[PDB]
A paper describes a structure:
Our work focuses on the biopolymer poly-β(1,6)-N-acetyl-D-glucosamine (PNAG), which is produced by numerous pathogenic organisms. The final protein is PgaB, a two-domain periplasmic protein with an N-terminal family four carbohydrate esterase (CE4) domain that displays metal-dependent deacetylation activity on PNAG oligomers. Deacetylation of PNAG by the N-terminal domain of PgaB is a critical step in polymer maturation and is required for the formation of robust biofilms. Herein, we show that the C-terminal domain of PgaB is a glycoside hydrolase active on partially deacetylated PNAG, and that the enzyme disrupts PNAG-dependent biofilms and potentiates killing by antibiotics.
Bb-GH crystallized in the monoclinic space-group P21. Diffraction data were collected to 1.76 Å resolution and the structure was determined by molecular replacement. Examination of the crystal packing in the asymmetric unit revealed two Bb-GH molecules packed in a head to head fashion. We do not believe this assembly is biologically relevant as size exclusion chromatography shows that Bb-GH elutes as a monomer in solution. Bb-GH adopts a (β/α)8 barrel fold observed in GH13 family members, and also common to a wide range of other glycoside hydrolases families. Along the top face of the (β/α)8 barrel is an extended electronegative groove that is approximately 43 Å long and 11 Å wide. There is also a defined pocket at the center of the groove. This central pocket and most of the electrostatic groove contain residues that are highly conserved among orthologues. Taken together, the mutagenesis data suggests that residues D326, D328, D364, and E585 play a role in substrate binding as the asparagine or glutamine mutants displayed detectable activity, while D474 is the most probable residue to be involved in catalysis as it is the only residue whose activity is ablated in both the asparagine and alanine variants. Considering that neither PgaBBb nor PgaBEc have sequence or structural similarity to the active site to DspB or other closely related GH family members, we propose that the C-terminal domain of PgaB defines a new GH family, GH153.
Author numbering: 318 to 670
The structure:
């Protein structure tokens, strides 16, 4: 079994001119037919500002405005014309519902964070410990399942909690239920409690995504609903950092069909990108995770706003192959600018590899 995946932004397809939008879609379909990946991870939410404040999505639903009714038709065209599997890529927590929504303002709190700033996680993450936020997110996933036909779910990288979160009253009450004091200062001060708390939050988020899976699978009438989740590299390279990510490679491997590991040394600011990738693969191997870890590479340098040379991307794929990491893919597909170069990547993205 081999996965070769392409993650695709509907933000790149969308255009206020529906005829331009159609031309955009056409270019995507042609590239995916040519490249023939195992799966496309398809954005179901809108994030055109790139700040992770998700006020709109691309499917009809009860809670958020629709930017365009686009996910269902792109998913169907990918499936039927390009012959690929399609995963719905959706946030776990970040839904900026309108005022008057029951979940409005029921967000993840931090003991130290102030207004007007953020850490890795978005300030807009709804608290999965709050019953109204829990239900609203559940209903958004239900509405996705009603609105479109797809083969899997990719749970987004927005599902993070740091070591000062979640400090909201509902979260504290949940920690008390785990046998911890409802007091993050007290938890953090005791290394044993701090470890238990970190692992507890990791499992809580995973369990929440399993709840969402159950909702979607019931509606897709499909027990074979495959799930993947984005995993940051730092918890893999340095597992102590689980405590301020709320993610874990061993726990992910136990719970998801695939782990979408963000193998992106450029984004990470790696001084020695080849060594970095070598160490990342070794870490995954050490956890016996190569069979279900997808090394998701970056095709764009988002910080400087430039495509990454396709030859650099291919060299990363060849390096992965040489190390026995046979599942991989890239994000994003810039189908309008023909980047990455499909001709150059075809041989390594082929499922005969």
């Amino acid at each position: 079994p081999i996965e070769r995946i392409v993650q695709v932004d509907l933000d790149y397809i969308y255009d206020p001119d529906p005829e331009q939008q159609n031309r955009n879609l056409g270019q995507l379909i042609d590239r995916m037919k040519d490249l023939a990946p195992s799966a496309v991870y398809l954005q179901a939410f809108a994030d055109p500002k790139g700040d992770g404040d998700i006020t709109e999505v691309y499917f009809p639903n009860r809670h958020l405005p629709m930017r365009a009714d686009l996910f269902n038709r792109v998913a169907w065209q990918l499936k039927t014309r390009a012959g690929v599997m399609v995963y719905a890529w959706l946030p776990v927590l970040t839904f900026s519902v309108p005022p008057g929504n029951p979940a409005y303002g029921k967000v993840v709190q931090s003991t130290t964070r102030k207004p007007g700033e953020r850490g890795l996680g978005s300030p807009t993450r709804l608290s999965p410990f709050h019953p109204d936020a829990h239900r609203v997110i559940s209903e958004i996933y239900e509405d996705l399942a009603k609105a479109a036909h797809f083969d899997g779910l990719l749970f987004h990288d927005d599902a993070v909690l740091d070591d000062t979160e979640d400090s909201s009253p509902e979260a504290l009450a949940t920690y008390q239920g785990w046998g911890l004091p409802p007091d993050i200062a007290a938890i953090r001060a005791d290394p044993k409690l701090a470890q238990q708390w970190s692992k507890g939050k990791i499992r809580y988020l995973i369990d929440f995504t399993m709840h969402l899976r159950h909702i979607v699978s019931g509606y897709q009438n499909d027990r074979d609903m495959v799930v993947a989740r984005n995993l940051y590299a730092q918890p893999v390279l340095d597992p102590v950092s689980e405590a301020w990510y709320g993610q874990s490679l061993p726990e992910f491997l136990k719970s998801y069909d695939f782990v979408a590991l963000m193998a992106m040394p450029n984004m990470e600011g790696a001084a020695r990108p080849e060594q970095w990738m070598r160490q990342l693969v070794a870490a995954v191997a050490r956890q016996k995770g190569l069979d279900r870890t997808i090394f998701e590479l970056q095709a764009r340098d988002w910080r400087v706003g430039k495509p990454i040379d396709t030859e650099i991307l291919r060299r990363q794929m060849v390096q992965l192959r040489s190390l026995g990491a046979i599942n991989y893919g890239y994000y994003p597909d810039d189908f309008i600018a023909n980047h990455p170069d499909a001709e150059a990547l075809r041989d390594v993205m082929s499922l005969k590899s």
